[PDB]
PDB file of C-alpha atoms and ligand atoms in Angstrom:
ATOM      1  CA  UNK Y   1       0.000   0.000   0.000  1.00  0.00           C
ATOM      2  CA  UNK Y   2       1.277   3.564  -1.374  1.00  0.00           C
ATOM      3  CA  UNK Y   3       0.067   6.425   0.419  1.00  0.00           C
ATOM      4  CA  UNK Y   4      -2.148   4.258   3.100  1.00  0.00           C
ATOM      5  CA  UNK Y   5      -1.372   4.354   7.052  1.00  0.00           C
ATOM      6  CA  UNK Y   6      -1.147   1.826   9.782  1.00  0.00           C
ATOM      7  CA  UNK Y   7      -4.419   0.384  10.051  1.00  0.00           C
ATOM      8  CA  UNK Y   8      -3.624  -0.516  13.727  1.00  0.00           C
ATOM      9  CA  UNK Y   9      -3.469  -4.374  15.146  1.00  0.00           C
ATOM     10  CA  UNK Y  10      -6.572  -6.624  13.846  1.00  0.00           C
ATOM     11  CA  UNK Y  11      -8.506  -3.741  12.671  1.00  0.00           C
ATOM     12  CA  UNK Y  12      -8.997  -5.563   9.767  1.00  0.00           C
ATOM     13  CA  UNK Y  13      -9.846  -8.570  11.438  1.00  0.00           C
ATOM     14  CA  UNK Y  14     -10.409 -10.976   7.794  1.00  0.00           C
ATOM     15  CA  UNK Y  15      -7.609 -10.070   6.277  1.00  0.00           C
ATOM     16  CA  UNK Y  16      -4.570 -12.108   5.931  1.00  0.00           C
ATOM     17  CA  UNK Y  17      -1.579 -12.815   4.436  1.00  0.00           C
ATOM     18  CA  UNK Y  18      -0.454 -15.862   2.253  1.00  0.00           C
ATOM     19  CA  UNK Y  19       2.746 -17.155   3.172  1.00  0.00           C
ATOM     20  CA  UNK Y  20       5.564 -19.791   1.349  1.00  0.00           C
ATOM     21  CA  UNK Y  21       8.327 -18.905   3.654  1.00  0.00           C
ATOM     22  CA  UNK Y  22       7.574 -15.878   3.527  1.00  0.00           C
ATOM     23  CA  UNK Y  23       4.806 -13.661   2.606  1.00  0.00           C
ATOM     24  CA  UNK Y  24       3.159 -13.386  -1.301  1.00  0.00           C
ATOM     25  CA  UNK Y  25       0.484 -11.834  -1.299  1.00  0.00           C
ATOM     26  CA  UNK Y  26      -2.818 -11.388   1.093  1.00  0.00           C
ATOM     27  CA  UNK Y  27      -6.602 -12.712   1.046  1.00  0.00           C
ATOM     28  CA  UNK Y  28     -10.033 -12.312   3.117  1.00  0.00           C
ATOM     29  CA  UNK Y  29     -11.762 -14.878   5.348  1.00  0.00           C
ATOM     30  CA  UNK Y  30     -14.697 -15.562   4.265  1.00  0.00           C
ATOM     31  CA  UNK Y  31     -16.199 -17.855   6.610  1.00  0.00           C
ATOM     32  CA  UNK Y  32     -14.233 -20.317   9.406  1.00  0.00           C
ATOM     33  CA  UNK Y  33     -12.525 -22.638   6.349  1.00  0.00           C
ATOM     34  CA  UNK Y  34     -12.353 -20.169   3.324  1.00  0.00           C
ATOM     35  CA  UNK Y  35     -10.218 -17.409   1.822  1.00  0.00           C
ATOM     36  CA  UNK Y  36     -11.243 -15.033  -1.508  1.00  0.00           C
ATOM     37  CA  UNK Y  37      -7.677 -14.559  -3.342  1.00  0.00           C
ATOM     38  CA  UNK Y  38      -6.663 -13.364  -6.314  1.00  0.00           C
ATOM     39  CA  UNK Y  39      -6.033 -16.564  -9.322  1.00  0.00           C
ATOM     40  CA  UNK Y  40      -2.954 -14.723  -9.914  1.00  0.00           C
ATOM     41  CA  UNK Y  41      -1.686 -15.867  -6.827  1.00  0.00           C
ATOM     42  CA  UNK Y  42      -1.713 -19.545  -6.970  1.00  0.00           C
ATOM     43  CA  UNK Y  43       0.718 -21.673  -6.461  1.00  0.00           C
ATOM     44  CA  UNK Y  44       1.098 -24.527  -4.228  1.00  0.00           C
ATOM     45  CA  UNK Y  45       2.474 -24.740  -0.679  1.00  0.00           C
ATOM     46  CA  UNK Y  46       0.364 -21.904   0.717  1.00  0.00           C
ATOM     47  CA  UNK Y  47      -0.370 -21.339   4.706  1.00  0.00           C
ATOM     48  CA  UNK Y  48      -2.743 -19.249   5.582  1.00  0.00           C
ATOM     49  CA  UNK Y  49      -1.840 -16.092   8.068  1.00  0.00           C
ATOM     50  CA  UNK Y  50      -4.695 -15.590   9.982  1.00  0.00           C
ATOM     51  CA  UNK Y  51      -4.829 -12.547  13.378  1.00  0.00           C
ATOM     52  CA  UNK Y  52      -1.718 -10.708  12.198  1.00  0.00           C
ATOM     53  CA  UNK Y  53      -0.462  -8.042  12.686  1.00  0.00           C
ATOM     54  CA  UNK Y  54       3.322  -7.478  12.394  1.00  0.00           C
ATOM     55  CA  UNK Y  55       4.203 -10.259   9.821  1.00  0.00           C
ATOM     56  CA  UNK Y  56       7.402 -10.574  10.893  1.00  0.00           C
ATOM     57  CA  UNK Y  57       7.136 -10.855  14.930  1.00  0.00           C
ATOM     58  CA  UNK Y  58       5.140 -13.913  16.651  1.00  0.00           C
ATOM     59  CA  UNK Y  59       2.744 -11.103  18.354  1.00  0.00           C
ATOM     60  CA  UNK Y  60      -0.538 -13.354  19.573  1.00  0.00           C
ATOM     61  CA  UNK Y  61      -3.446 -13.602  18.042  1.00  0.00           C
ATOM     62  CA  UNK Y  62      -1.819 -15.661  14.810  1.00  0.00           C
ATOM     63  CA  UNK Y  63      -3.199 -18.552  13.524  1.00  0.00           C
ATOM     64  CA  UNK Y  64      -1.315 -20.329  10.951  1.00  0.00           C
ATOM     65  CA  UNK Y  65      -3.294 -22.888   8.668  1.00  0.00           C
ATOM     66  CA  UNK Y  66      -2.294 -24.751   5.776  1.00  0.00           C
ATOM     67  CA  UNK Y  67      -4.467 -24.605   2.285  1.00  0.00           C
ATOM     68  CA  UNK Y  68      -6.109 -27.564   1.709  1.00  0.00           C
ATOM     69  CA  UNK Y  69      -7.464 -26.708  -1.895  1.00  0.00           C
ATOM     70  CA  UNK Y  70      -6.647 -23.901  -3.965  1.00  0.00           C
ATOM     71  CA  UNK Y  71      -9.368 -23.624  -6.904  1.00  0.00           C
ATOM     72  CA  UNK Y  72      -8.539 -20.820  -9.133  1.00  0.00           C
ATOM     73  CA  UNK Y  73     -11.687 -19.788 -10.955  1.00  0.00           C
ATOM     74  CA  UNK Y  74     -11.793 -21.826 -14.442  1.00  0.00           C
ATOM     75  CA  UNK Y  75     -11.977 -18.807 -16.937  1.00  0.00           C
ATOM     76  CA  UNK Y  76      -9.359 -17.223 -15.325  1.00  0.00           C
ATOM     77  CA  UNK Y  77      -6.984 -15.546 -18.136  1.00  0.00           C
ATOM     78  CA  UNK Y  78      -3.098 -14.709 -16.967  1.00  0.00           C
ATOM     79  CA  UNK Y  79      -2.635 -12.758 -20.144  1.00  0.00           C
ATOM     80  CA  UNK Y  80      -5.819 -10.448 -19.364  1.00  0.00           C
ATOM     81  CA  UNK Y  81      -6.023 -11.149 -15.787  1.00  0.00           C
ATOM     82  CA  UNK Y  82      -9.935 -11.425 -16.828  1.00  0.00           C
ATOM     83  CA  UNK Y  83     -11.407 -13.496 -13.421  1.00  0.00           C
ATOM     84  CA  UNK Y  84      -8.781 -12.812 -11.310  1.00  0.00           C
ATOM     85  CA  UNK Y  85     -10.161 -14.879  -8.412  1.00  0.00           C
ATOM     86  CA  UNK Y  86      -9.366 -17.971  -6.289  1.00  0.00           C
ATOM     87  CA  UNK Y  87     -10.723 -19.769  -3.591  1.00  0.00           C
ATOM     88  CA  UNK Y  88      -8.747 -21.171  -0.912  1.00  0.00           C
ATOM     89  CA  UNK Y  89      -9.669 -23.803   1.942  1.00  0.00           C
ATOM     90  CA  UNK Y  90      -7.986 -24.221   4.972  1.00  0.00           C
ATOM     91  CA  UNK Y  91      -6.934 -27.812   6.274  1.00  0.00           C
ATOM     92  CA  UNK Y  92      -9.141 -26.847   9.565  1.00  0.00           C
ATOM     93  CA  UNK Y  93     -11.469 -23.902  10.561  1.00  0.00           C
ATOM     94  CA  UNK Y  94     -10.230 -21.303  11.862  1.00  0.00           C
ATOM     95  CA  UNK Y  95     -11.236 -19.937  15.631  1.00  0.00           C
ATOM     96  CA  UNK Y  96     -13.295 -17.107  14.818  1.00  0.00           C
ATOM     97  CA  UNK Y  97     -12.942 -14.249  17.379  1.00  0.00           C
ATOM     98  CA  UNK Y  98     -12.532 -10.551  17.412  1.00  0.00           C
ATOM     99  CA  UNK Y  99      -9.465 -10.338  15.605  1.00  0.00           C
ATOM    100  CA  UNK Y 100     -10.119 -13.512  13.148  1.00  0.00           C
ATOM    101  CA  UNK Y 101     -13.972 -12.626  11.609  1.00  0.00           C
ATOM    102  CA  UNK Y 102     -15.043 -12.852   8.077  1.00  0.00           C
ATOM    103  CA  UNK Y 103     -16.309 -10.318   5.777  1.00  0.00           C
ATOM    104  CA  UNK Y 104     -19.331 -10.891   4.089  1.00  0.00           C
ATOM    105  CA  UNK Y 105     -20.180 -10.768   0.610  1.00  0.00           C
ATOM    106  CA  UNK Y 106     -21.835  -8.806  -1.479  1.00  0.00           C
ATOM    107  CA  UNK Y 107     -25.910  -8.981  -2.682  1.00  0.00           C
ATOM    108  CA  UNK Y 108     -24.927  -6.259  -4.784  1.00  0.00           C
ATOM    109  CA  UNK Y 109     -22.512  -4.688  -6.786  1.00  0.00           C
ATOM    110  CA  UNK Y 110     -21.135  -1.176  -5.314  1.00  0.00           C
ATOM    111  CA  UNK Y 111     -21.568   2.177  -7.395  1.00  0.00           C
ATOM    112  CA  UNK Y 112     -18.633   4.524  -8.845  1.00  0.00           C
ATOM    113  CA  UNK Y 113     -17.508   7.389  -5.676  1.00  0.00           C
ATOM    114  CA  UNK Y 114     -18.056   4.694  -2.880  1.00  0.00           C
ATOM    115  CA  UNK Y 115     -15.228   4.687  -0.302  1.00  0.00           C
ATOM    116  CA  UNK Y 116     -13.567   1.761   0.525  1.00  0.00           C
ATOM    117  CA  UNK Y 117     -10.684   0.878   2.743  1.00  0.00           C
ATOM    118  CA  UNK Y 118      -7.967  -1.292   0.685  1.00  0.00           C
ATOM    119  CA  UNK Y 119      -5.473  -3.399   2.908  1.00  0.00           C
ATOM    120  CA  UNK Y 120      -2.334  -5.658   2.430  1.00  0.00           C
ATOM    121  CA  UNK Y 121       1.569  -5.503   3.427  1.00  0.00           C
ATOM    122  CA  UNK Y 122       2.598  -5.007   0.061  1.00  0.00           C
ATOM    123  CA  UNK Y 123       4.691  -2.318  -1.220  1.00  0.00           C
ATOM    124  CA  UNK Y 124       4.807   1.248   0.414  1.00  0.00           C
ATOM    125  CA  UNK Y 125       6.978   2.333  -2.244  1.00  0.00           C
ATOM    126  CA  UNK Y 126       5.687   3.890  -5.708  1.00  0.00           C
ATOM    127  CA  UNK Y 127       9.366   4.173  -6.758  1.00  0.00           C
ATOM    128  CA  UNK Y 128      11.746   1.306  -5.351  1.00  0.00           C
ATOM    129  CA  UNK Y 129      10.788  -0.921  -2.645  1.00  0.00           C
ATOM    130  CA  UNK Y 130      10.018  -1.209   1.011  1.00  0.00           C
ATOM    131  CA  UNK Y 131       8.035  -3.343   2.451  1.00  0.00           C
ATOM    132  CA  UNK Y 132       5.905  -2.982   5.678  1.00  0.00           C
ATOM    133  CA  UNK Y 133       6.151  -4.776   9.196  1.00  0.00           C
ATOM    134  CA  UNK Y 134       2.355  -4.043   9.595  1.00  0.00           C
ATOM    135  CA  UNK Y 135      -0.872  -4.167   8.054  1.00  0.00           C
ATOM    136  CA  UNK Y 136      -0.944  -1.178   5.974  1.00  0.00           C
ATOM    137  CA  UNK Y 137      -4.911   0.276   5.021  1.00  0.00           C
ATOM    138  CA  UNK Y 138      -5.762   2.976   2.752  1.00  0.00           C
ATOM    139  CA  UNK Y 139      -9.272   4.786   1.863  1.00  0.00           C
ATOM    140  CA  UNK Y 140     -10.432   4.939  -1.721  1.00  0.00           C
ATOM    141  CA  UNK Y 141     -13.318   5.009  -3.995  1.00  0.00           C
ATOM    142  CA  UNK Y 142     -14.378   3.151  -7.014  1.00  0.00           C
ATOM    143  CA  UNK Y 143     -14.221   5.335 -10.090  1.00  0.00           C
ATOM    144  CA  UNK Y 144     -16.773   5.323 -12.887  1.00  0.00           C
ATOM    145  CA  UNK Y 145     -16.486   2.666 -15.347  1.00  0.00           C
ATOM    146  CA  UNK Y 146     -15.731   5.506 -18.165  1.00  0.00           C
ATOM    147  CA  UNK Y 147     -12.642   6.570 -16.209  1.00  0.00           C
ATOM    148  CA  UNK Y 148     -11.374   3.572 -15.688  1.00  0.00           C
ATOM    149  CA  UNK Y 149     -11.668   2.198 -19.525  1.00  0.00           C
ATOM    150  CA  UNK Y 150      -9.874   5.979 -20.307  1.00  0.00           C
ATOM    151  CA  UNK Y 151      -7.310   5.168 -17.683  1.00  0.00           C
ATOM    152  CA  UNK Y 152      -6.775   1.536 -19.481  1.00  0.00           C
ATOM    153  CA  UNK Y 153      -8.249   1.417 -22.837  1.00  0.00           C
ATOM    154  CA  UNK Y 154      -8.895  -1.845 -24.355  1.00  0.00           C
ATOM    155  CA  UNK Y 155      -8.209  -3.444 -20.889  1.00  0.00           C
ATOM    156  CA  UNK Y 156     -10.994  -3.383 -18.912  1.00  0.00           C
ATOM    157  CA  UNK Y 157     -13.644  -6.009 -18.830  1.00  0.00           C
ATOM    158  CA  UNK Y 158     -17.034  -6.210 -16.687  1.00  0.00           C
ATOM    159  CA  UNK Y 159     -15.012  -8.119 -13.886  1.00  0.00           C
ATOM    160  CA  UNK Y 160     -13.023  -5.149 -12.948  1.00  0.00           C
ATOM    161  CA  UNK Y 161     -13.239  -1.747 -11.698  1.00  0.00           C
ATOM    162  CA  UNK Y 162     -10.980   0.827 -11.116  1.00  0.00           C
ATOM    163  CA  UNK Y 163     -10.207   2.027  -7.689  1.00  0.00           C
ATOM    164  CA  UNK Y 164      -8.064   4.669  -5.893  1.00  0.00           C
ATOM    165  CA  UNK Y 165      -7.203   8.357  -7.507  1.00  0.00           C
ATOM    166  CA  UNK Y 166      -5.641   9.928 -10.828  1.00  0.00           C
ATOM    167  CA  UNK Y 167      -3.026  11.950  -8.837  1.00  0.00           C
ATOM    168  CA  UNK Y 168      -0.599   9.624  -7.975  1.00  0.00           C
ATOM    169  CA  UNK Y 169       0.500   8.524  -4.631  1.00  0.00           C
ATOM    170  CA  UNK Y 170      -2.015   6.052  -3.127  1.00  0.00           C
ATOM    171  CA  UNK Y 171      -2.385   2.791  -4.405  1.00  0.00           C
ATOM    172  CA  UNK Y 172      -2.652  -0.579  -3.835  1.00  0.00           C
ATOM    173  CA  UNK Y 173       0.842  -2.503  -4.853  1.00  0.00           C
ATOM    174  CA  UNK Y 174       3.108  -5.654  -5.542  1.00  0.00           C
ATOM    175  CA  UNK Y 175       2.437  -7.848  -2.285  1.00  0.00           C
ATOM    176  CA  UNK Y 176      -1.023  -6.437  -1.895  1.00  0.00           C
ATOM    177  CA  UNK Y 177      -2.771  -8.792  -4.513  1.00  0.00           C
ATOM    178  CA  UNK Y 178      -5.281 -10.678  -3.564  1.00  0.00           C
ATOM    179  CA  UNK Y 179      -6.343  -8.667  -0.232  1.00  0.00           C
ATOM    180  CA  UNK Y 180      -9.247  -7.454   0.463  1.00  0.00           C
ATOM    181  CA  UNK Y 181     -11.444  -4.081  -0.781  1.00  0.00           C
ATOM    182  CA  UNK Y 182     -14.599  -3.701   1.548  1.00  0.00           C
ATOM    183  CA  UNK Y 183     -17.161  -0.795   0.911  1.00  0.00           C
ATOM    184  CA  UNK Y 184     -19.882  -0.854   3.285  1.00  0.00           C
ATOM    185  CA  UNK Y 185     -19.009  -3.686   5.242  1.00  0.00           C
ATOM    186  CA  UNK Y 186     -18.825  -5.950   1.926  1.00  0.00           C
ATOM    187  CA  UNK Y 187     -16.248  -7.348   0.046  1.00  0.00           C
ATOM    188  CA  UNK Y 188     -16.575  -5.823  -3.531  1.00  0.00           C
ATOM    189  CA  UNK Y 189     -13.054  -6.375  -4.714  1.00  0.00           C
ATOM    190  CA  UNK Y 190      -9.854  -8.139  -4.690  1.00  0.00           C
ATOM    191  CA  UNK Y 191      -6.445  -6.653  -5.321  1.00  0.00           C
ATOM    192  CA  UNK Y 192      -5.487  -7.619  -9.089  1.00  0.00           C
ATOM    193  CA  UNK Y 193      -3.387  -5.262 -11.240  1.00  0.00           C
ATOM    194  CA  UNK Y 194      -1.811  -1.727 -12.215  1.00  0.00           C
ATOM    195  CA  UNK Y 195       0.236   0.217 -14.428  1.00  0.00           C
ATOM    196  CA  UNK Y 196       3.314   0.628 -11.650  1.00  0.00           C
ATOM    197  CA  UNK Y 197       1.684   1.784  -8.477  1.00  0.00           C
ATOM    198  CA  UNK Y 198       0.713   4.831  -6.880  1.00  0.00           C
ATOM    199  CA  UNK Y 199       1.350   6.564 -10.938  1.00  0.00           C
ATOM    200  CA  UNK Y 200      -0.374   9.498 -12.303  1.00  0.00           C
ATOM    201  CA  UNK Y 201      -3.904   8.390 -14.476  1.00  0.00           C
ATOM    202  CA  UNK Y 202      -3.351   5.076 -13.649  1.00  0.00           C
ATOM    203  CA  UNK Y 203      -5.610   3.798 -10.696  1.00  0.00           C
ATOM    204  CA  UNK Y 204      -6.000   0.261  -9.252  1.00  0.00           C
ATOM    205  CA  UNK Y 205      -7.865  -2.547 -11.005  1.00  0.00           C
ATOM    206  CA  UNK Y 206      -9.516  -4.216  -9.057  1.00  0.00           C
ATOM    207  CA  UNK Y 207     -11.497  -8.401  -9.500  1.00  0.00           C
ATOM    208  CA  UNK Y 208     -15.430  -7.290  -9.053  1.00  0.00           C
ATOM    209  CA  UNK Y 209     -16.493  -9.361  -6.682  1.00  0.00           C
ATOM    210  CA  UNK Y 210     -20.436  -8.781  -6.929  1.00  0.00           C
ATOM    211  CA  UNK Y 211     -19.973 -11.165 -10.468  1.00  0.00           C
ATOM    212  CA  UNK Y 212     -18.553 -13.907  -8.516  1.00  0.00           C
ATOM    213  CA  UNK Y 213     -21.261 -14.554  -5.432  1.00  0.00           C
ATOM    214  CA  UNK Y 214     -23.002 -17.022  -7.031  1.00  0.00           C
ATOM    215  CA  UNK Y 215     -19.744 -18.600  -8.265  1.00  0.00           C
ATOM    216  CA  UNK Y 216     -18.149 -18.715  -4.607  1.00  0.00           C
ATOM    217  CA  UNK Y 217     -21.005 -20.316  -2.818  1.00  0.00           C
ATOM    218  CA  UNK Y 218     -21.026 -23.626  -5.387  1.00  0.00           C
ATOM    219  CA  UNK Y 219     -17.768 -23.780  -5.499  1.00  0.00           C
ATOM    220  CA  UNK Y 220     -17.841 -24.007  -1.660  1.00  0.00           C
ATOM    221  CA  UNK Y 221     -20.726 -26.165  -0.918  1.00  0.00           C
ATOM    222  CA  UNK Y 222     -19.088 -28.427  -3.761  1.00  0.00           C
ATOM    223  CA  UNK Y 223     -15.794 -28.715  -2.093  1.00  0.00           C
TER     224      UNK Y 223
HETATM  225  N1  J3I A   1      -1.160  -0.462  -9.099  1.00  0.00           N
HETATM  226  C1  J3I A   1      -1.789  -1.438  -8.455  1.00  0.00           C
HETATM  227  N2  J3I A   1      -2.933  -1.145  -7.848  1.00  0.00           N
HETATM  228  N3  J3I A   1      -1.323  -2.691  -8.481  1.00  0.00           N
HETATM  229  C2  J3I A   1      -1.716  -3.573  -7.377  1.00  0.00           C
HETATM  230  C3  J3I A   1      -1.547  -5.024  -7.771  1.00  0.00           C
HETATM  231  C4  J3I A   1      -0.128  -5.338  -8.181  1.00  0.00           C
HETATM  232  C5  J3I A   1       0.281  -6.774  -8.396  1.00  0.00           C
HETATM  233  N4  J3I A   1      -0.339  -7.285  -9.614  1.00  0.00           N
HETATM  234  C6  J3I A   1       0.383  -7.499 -10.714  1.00  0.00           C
HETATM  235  O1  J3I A   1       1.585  -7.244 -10.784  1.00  0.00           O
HETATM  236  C7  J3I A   1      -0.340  -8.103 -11.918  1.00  0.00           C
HETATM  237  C8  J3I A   1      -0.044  -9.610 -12.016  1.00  0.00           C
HETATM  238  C9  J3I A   1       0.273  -9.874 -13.464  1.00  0.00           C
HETATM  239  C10 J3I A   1       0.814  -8.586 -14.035  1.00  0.00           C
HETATM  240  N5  J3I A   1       0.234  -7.552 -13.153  1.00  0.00           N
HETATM  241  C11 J3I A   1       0.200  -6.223 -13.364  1.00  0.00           C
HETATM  242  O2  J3I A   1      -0.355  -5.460 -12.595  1.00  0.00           O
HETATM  243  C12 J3I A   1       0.846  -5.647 -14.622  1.00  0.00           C
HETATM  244  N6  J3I A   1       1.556  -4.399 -14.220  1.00  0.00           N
HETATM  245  C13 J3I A   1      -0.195  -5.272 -15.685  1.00  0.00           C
HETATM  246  C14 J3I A   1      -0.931  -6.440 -16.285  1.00  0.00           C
HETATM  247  C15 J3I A   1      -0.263  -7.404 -17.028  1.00  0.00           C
HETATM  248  C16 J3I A   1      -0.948  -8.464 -17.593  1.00  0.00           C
HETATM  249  C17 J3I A   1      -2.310  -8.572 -17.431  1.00  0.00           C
HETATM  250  C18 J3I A   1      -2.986  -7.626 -16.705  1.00  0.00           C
HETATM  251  C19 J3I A   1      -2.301  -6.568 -16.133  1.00  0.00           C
HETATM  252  C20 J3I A   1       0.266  -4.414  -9.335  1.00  0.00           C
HETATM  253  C21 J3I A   1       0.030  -2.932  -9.008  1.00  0.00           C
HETATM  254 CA1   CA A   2       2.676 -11.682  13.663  1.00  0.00          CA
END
């Protein structure tokens, strides 16, 4: 996160981080054994990083669980990113308290100028690199479809939106994908892509969530 602040310790209770020895990118709990990701973050090997805070310092409140599936959705597209979404189970449920708690989805999709907060240890850097010992958050609001598409023409399908600002300097970033963007108490998007981060004209794009409810709850009650 460019531009964002210290969200303070399990503010962001469903958010967590995906770790292979270290950590890749972050996620939302959906219920006690199931993360929303983005598809661009697969790969095998994941635990689950659920309660944290500091990433880096065993603080309390952590609960570490290994993925038992990852199921990336089926039209996903790496060239386009088009359905940039996973699902991820954990071995067992987590303890849901708190500081663990799941964020609920959508029943409808959100409308261009709603606020959002946007969370993830990624990068805090839009030039270089630093990354953060803590969660990082940052407040932004979906744009209108027609800036967006001007922001990244040809690019833009109806499984994305744009979030953030034109002006540079707050962003989402590398090490943020696949966390979490709530609006009204809803999950409406997942971190998925950019043009840098934190650059002039060039917002966050963002997995639309709303497209996918349907989608998640088979895929869960199948698995
Ligand atoms: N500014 C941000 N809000 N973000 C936040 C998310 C991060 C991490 N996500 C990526 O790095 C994704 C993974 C694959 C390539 N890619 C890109 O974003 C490419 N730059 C553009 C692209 C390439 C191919 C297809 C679709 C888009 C990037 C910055
Ligand atoms: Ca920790």
């Amino acid at each position: 996160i460019v531009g964002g602040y210290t969200c303070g310790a399990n503010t962001v209770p469903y958010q967590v981080s995906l770790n292979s020895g270290y950590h890749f990118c972050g996620g939302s709990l959906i219920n006690s054994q199931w993360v929303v990701s983005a598809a661009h973050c697969y790969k095998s090997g994941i635990q689950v990083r659920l309660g944290e805070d500091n990433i880096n310092v065993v603080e309390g409140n952590e609960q570490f669980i290994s993925a038992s599936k990852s199921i990336v959705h089926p039209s996903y597209n790496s060239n386009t990113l088009n359905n940039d979404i996973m699902l991820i189970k954990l071995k067992s449920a987590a303890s849901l308290n708190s500081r663990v708690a799941s964020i609920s989805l959508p029943t409808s999709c959100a409308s261009a100028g709603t606020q959002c907060l946007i969370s993830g240890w990624g990068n805090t850097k839009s030039s270089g690199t630093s990354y953060p010992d803590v969660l990082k958050c940052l407040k932004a609001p979906i744009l209108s479809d027609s800036s967006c598409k001007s922001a990244y023409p040809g690019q833009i399908t109806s499984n994305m939106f744009c979030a953030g600002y034109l002006e540079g300097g707050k962003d989402s970033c590398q090490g943020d994908s696949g966390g979490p963007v709530v609006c009204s108490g809803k999950l409406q998007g997942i971190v998925s892509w950019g043009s840098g981060c934190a650059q002039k004209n060039k917002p966050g794009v963002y997995t639309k969530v709303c497209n996918y409810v349907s989608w998640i709850k088979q895929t869960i009650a199948s698995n």
